[PDB]
Amino acid sequence: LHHAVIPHGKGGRSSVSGIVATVFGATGFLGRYLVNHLGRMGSQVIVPYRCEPYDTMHLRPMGDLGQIIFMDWNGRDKDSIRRAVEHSNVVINLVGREWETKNFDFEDVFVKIPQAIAQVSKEAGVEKFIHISHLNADIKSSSKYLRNKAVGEKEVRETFPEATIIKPADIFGREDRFLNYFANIRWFGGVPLISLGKKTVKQPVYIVDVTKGIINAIKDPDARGKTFAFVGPNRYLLFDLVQYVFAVAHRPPWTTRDKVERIHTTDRTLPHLPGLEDLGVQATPLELKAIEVLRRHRTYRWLSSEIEDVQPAK
Amino acid sequence: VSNLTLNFGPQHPAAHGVLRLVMELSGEMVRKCDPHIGLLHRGTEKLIEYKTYLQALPYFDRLDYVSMMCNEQAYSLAVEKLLNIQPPPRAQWIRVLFGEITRLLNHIMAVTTHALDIGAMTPFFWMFEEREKMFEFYERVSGARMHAAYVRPGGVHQDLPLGLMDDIYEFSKNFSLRIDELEEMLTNNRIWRNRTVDIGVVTAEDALNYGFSGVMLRGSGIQWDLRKTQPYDVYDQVEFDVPIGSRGDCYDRYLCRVEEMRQSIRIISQCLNKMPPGEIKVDDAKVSPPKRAEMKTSMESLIHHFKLYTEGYQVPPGATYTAIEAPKGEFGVYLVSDGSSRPYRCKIKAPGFAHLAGLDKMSKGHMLADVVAIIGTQDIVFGEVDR
């Protein structure tokens, strides 16, 4: 054994597969799914967790035995992150709230934490480090978190040059914070957005496509040192989304223009970057999965739901 | 159209095992009930084929867990019968003793849990205290609480610890008083009675075709017993008498279980009086292991030890069906032996697997609220039914 060298048997549930890794965050959503694929293919996992002992139990069933091992840490001091990644095939980063809390700010959450964990990543002598951020991270203003995190990718690429720095677009799934938010914003006052109308082009991407993107990126060579993004394959919707996802599924602490300007951010940005198939994985249109996650209503009639089919100028 | 389809429920607070059920009914009345069994099925009979006789025996312990030493007695009698061996007398007597003790267990459970299901929170408590005394006996005997075997082919091993029969006597002394306390707790209660009187009756010949064997045939006409007719061990000798009932009414079956508890006290008593001090295991070194004193210091004892554990004794080929009286009724294993160490194919017979198939007819005439009592009345364990 050199580095986890010899996978065994049909992948998953005690099949060794290839990797060890680690996942920061993972206490909710995208990390949860990602670990579900890593353990689902049998690899060992290390999930460092916040001081909450209880809420991580939901992640237990997906690790078989002797895998998904837990340890305490906090992003402030080196030695914890140092201790977590000592033995790893790779390491990947998922971090940060969509709002600011007390001690933490939008700065240092996408800034200092990647600085540290990437620094000790290089010092630990580990390869294939994956780092993520939001799509259309730009030095230009109108989104605090976004200019910040853009500087995040700046330093993440400055130190530890070789790594996959990958921007998904608005990520879409079961427990996610985006489309569910639109479903829950319909309440009193009816003023979520469309203040000036239009002006918003957006292409949400369904989650399993993203996480499969990460797992191919992690186990496929020539995914290192190449930055690229994810794209909702077809939809590329206007605000007609809001009235769509509001139409289907019918009808029954946050933050300011940080949040509403966040969701109001508009761009698909730059065409030339390896999109999806350049990483070799299929893409999912919105419809079916949207039904799945939405549920609700009275459930008794399948009906049609009249797909939006914005595809403006597409 | 009308009717319905309703379903089971996951547990009552005492629930032993879970069934589903689908009852096509009329307004608060069940026209058709179709129990779905097989919910808890652990696939024992496929496992036994892979493990030698001495190994597969705990399966015959825990296939029906409530009554245990009885099932032990069934499988052991099967291997002895097919293997041409007799256990020494004292082994037979001990086996009888704990047989009827175990019968006292499964009966007191069936009755009490039948109460707790229906209502009547307390009798469960009063009597399962005494049941805890019973397991206090097992823990001395076999060195564990419930599933500990303490039964082999060719006789039991590890005879009673010195001073056990005193405790046995002491419990058996006043158990009569306490069970009579239950008989005042019930039996002339207008509630319990007036809930179960005519519910789920059976015609004798009908019970024969449906193959019910147990307190069923007892309480409904058709006087029959395996204990009396086909004595399988020294259990022949001791005197006692079985009850019956003429109403076939499911109340008779209750009272018959009771009187079988009392008679079980008689059998326990006489057994304590008759106990010969012969020995535990048979003396044939190749059927059953030697005790350690002979094991060490003596060569052939060592060999028969070592092989009798690794390979295990070989049983000549033959097909046997043995049947005993177990507190749920007639229980039996059909052994099929290639001349070998391992068994080959052995299908146990679960009385619950028969009795359960009868709910179709038995429950045809009473609404579901008493379909509760219809299921609970015939002693049944869904761990034994499935297998």
Binding site: G9 | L47, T52, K81, G339, Y344
Partner: protein, 208 residues
Amino acid sequence: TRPTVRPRNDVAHKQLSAFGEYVAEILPKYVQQVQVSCFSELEICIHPDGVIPVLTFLRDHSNAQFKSLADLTAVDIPTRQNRFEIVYNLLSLRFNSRIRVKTYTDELTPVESSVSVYKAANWYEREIWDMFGVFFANHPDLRRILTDYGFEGHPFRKDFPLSGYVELRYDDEVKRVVAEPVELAQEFRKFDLNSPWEAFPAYRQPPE
């Protein structure tokens, strides 16, 4: 032979031999082989036709009753031109006796509806279907007992390994229990316990 050995009786032996012989005289059509175990349990072999006639008989005739069906089962034996032995095991209520009825079938050849004699045969037959796959002609119902609804493959038959071909687990992807090709943490270590020397000289077969 006095201690340690079961004393055997020749009374029940002669009686049961007489009775089986009798059955052979009265039913020449279906009867093939009538034997008595040396521990005295009569066992009758029957062609896979007269199961209905033979059992209709053994329930009646007033010189035999067998009102109660003890247990219905089967044994999966490869090496035979017919894989299975359907074993009817009966209980005589009046006379204190039990006799067995063996019949055979392959996979495709059905055995026809023993229900019409004994109601107790109702579930035993279904359980046989699910766990083996012997089909039963015009049974009032056929369903799955003891196995999962979507399950397949008739487990008890030796073609089916100890473990299954599937497992269950749960994952936050689909929010439902799923199935994956069986993967054991431990190999299920296999043992060869069968020793040479033919411990039993009697049952030996002629070599060829």
